[PDB]
C-alpha cells in the first residue's frame, strides 16, 4: 500500500451499488440481538456511525453483551481473539 | 526502433490519457478509404485476419494501410470500392531511454492490440479482387502471419 | 463405492492434496482404500484425481483383493473366510465384499485396516503422466479398467 | 365534471428586478401589502458580487387582493399569445405575473401525501386564454 489509513483499499467494500444508494431503512438499525447470537459483520455504506475496522467486513462473530446501544461482538482475527464495538446497522443474523 | 520491442501483449493495458501525457499523435492518415460516401452495398467483401494476438504500432498500421490502399489504385483515385481499418492504437507504449534506476519509461508511441483471428482490414469490392493483392502487400508490413478471408463471395 | 489407489508419490504434490489422501487413509504409493459415493467423498477424490486411480470394482475383484490384501486393525492375521466369519457380521469374504460395495458397512466397522496395501502392478500400469482417456492410468476408470489394475496388483 | 375543472387565479406576483429598495413603497401601494426583499445568487461584474443582498422586491397576491389588482393591471397591458406559459400562465409589464390553475392544486402544495398534478389536469395555454379573455378584455 502507498498509505496505511483504515480506508486504504476500501473503495469497493465501502461503496454502494447505485441503486442501494441513499439513507438505509431504519428497521435493521434498530434490530435487537441476544448474547450468543451469531451475526455477520458488514458495514452499510450509507450508515456513518457504529462502524468497525473495514478489515473485519465478512467476519461472523458472536454477540456478547453491548455498550450503550452498540453491540460488543467477539470474533477471531486469524488466530487472535478480538472484541468489536458495532451497531445493529452493520449486523445481520446468521441463518 | 524494432517491432521486437513492442509486439507482445505482455504488459498491462496502458490507455488512460487522464494519467498519461506527452503521447505522440498517430501516423494513421485515415480509417475509411475509397467511396466512403456509399454504404457496404457490394457483392464481395474480403478481410485481412491477423492470426496471432499482437501489438501493432501506429507505424505499421500506416505503412500497411498505405501499401494496400495506395495499391488499390489499380482501380483509380475515385474507383468503386471501400476500404476500412477497424483497429485504433489505444495502447500507449514507453521506452526507458540512470540505468535500471527509475526505469518507468517515457511515452514514445502507441499501438493497437489485435487478437488472433480478428480482422484488421476489410475491403468491399465488386467481382474485381485486386484487393486480394492489396493485402498480400499489407500483411507484409505487420508482425503477424495473416489470413486473407473472403466473406460475401461465392463467385469463384 | 469406489476403489482408490495412490499411484503418484508425495514429493512435490500439494499439501492440501496430500492431506486429503491421508484423510482417506492412504499414506503410501500403491495403497488402496474403499470409499462410499457421497457428496463429501466425491469432492475429495476429485481433488486427489491427478495422483490416483479409482473406480467401482466388480464383486469378484474386490473379493480377490480382500482375500489377498486385507488386514486386521492390528496384526499379521490373514483375512480369509474363516477370519471374516469368526470376526465379522458376515459369513465369508463374498459376504463382506457385497456389504462394502452396497455401502452397508466399512473395513473399520469390521475390525479391518482401512487400507489394502497392494503390490506393484504385474506387467506395469499405463503411466502416471496421462489420464485414462489418454492411455494413462490416472483418474476415473471402468469397472473393467479398475479390475485390471487391482488384479495386476493383487 | 366541470366546476372542479374551471380555471382560477392563484397568486399574482408583482416584482421590480432592480440592481441594488426605495421601490418597495410603490409596490406597497400598487398592491396593498408589504413587499419582500430579493437577495441574489452568484458574484457578477455588474458590481453585484454580494451574495446576500437586497436587489429588488416582489409581492404575491392571492384572492381578492389579486383580482382587485388585475382589474387595473390587465387594462394596462395589451399583449397575449406566445407570451403565455405552457401551463397556462403569463407575465406582462415592473413585472406582473399571473399563475393560473384548476381546483385541486393543493394536492401538490401540501405537506402530506403531496403529489404532482397530472398533465391532463394541468392547464393549457389555450384553456387559459379562454378563462381570462372571458373576463374584461381580448386575447392576442
Amino acid at each position: 500500500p502507498s498509505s496505511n489509513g483504515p480506508l486504504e483499499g476500501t473503495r469497493g467494500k465501502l461503496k454502494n451499488k447505485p441503486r442501494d444508494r441513499g439513507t438505509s431503512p431504519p428497521q435493521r438499525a434498530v434490530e435487537e440481538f441476544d448474547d450468543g447470537e451469531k451475526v455477520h459483520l458488514k458495514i452499510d455504506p450509507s450508515v456513518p456511525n457504529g462502524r468497525f475496522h473495514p478489515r473485519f467486513d465478512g467476519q461472523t462473530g458472536t454477540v456478547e453483551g453491548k455498550q450503550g446501544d452498540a453491540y460488543k461482538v467477539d470474533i477471531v482475527d486469524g488466530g487472535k481473539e478480538k472484541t468489536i464495538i458495532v451497531t445493529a446497522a452493520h449486523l445481520r443474523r446468521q441463518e | 526502433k524494432p517491432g521486437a520491442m513492442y509486439r507482445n501483449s505482455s504488459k498491462p493495458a496502458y490507455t488512460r490519457r487522464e494519467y498519461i501525457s506527452g503521447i505522440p499523435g498517430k501516423k494513421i492518415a485515415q480509417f475509411d478509404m475509397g467511396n466512403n460516401g456509399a454504404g457496404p452495398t457490394y457483392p464481395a467483401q474480403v478481410e485481412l485476419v491477423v492470426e496471432k494476438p499482437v501489438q501493432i504500432r501506429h507505424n505499421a498500421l500506416e505503412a500497411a494501410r498505405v501499401a494496400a490502399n495506395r495499391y488499390v489504385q489499380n482501380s483509380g483515385a475515385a474507383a468503386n470500392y471501400k476500404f476500412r481499418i477497424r483497429k485504433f492504437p489505444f495502447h500507449v507504449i514507453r521506452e526507458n531511454k540512470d540505468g535500471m534506476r527509475a526505469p518507468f519509461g517515457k511515452p514514445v508511441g502507441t499501438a493497437a492490440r489485435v487478437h488472433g483471428a480478428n480482422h484488421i482490414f476489410i475491403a468491399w469490392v465488386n467481382p474485381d479482387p485486386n484487393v486480394e493483392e492489396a493485402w498480400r502487400r499489407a500483411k507484409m508490413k505487420v508482425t503477424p502471419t495473416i489470413n486473407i478471408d473472403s466473406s460475401p463471395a461465392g463467385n469463384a | 463405492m469406489h476403489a482408490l489407489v495412490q499411484l503418484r508419490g508425495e514429493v512435490n504434490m500439494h499439501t492440501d492434496i496430500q492431506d486429503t489422501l491421508e484423510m482417506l487413509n492412504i499414506h503410501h504409493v500403491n495403497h488402496c482404500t474403499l470409499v462410499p459415493e457421497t457428496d463429501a467423498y466425491r469432492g475429495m477424490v476429485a481433488k486427489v484425481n491427478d495422483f490416483v486411480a479409482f473406480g467401482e470394482p466388480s464383486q469378484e475383484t474386490l473379493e480377490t483383493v480382500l482375500a489377498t490384501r486385507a488386514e486386521p486393525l492390528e496384526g499379521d492375521a490373514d483375512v480369509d473366510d474363516e477370519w471374516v466369519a469368526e470376526h465379522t457380521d458376515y459369513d465369508d469374504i463374498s459376504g463382506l465384499a457385497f456389504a462394502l460395495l452396497s455401502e452397508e458397512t466399512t473395513l473399520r466397522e469390521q475390525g479391518l485396516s482401512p487400507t489394502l496395501r497392494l503390490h506393484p502392478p504385474r506387467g506395469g500400469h499405463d503411466g502416471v503422466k496421462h489420464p485414462v482417456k489418454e492411455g494413462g492410468q490416472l483418474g476415473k476408470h471402468d469397472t473393467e479398467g479398475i479390475d485390471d489394475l487391482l488384479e495386476a496388483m493383487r | 365534471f366541470h366546476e372542479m375543472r374551471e380555471p382560477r387565479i392563484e397568486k399574482v406576483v408583482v416584482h421590480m428586478g432592480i440592481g441594488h429598495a426605495n421601490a418597495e413603497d410603490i409596490l406597497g401601494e400598487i398592491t396593498g401589502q408589504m413587499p419582500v426583499r430579493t437577495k441574489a445568487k452568484r458574484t457578477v461584474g455588474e458590481f453585484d458580487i454580494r451574495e446576500g443582498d437586497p436587489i429588488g422586491a416582489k409581492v404575491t397576491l392571492r384572492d381578492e387582493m389579486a383580482e382587485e389588482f388585475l382589474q387595473t393591471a390587465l387594462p394596462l397591458a395589451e399583449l397575449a399569445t406566445s407570451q403565455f406559459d405552457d401551463t397556462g400562465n403569463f407575465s406582462f409589464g415592473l413585472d406582473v405575473t399571473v399563475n393560473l390553475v384548476r381546483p385541486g392544486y393543493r394536492v401538490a402544495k401540501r405537506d402530506k401525501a403531496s403529489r404532482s398534478i397530472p398533465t391532463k389536469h394541468r392547464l393549457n395555454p389555450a384553456d387559459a386564454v379562454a378563462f381570462i379573455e372571458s373576463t374584461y378584455d381580448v386575447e392576442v
Partner: protein, 186 residues
C-alpha cells in the same frame, strides 16, 4: 425509471407519508409510538410497536367511534382530538401498555395543536409519555371554548343543523367524565 443506475425512493417516501429520518429517532426510545394522525373530518390515535414484518398496533381510537359513547358533535376539532387520545390511551392501558413516545408524522409541532391534544388525552388516560406542558393548549380550548365563543359571534349557527346552536364544551366534560370509568371496550 430512467436507467439501471436510477435510484427510486422507498415506497413510503414516494407516497410522501413516512419521514424515515424522524422515524429512526423515534424508534430509538425502544418504546411504543403514540401515532397521532388527522383527517379533514376525523382524528386517529394508535399505539404502535415494532414487528418482524411491519408495525403492530396494540391499541387505537378513532374520532368516529367516539359517538359510540355519546358524542353528538363534529369530530375534527380539539375536544374531539383530546378525547380520541384519552380513549386510545385507555384501551392502551387495558392492553398492558404503559409508556410511549409521540409520533406526529408529517404534522407540525405547533403549540396547542390537535396532535398535542391527542397527546394530552393519552397521558391523562395514564400512559407515560415524554412531553412538555407548555406546548399544550390551555384546557379551555381543549374543552372547545374557542369554538363556543366563535358561535357567540353568531347571527348564523356555526353548526349546520348538527346539535345545539351555541355549542357545548360541557358535552366535552360529560364525555371525558364518561370515559374515566367502566363502560365497554375500555
Amino acid at each position: 425509471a430512467t436507467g439501471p443506475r436510477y435510484k427510486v425512493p422507498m415506497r413510503r417516501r414516494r407516497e410522501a407519508r413516512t419521514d424515515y429520518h424522524q422515524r429512526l429517532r423515534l424508534l430509538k426510545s425502544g418504546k411504543p409510538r403514540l401515532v397521532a394522525r388527522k383527517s379533514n373530518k376525523h382524528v386517529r390515535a394508535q399505539l404502535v410497536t415494532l414487528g418482524p414484518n411491519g408495525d403492530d398496533t396494540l391499541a387505537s381510537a378513532h374520532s368516529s367511534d367516539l359517538a359510540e359513547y355519546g358524542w353528538e358533535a363534529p369530530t375534527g376539532n380539539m375536544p374531539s382530538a383530546y378525547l380520541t387520545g384519552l380513549l386510545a390511551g385507555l384501551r392502551a392501558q387495558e392492553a398492558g401498555v404503559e409508556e410511549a413516545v409521540l409520533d406526529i408524522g408529517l404534522n407540525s409541532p405547533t403549540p396547542g395543536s390537535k396532535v398535542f391534544a391527542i397527546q394530552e388525552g393519552a397521558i391523562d388516560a395514564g400512559l407515560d409519555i415524554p412531553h412538555n406542558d407548555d406546548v399544550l393548549a390551555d384546557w379551555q380550548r381543549t374543552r372547545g371554548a374557542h369554538i363556543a365563543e366563535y358561535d357567540e359571534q353568531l347571527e348564523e349557527p356555526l353548526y349546520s343543523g348538527d346539535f345545539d346552536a351555541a355549542d357545548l364544551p360541557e358535552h366535552f366534560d360529560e364525555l371525558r367524565e364518561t370515559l374515566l370509568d367502566g363502560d365497554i371496550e375500555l
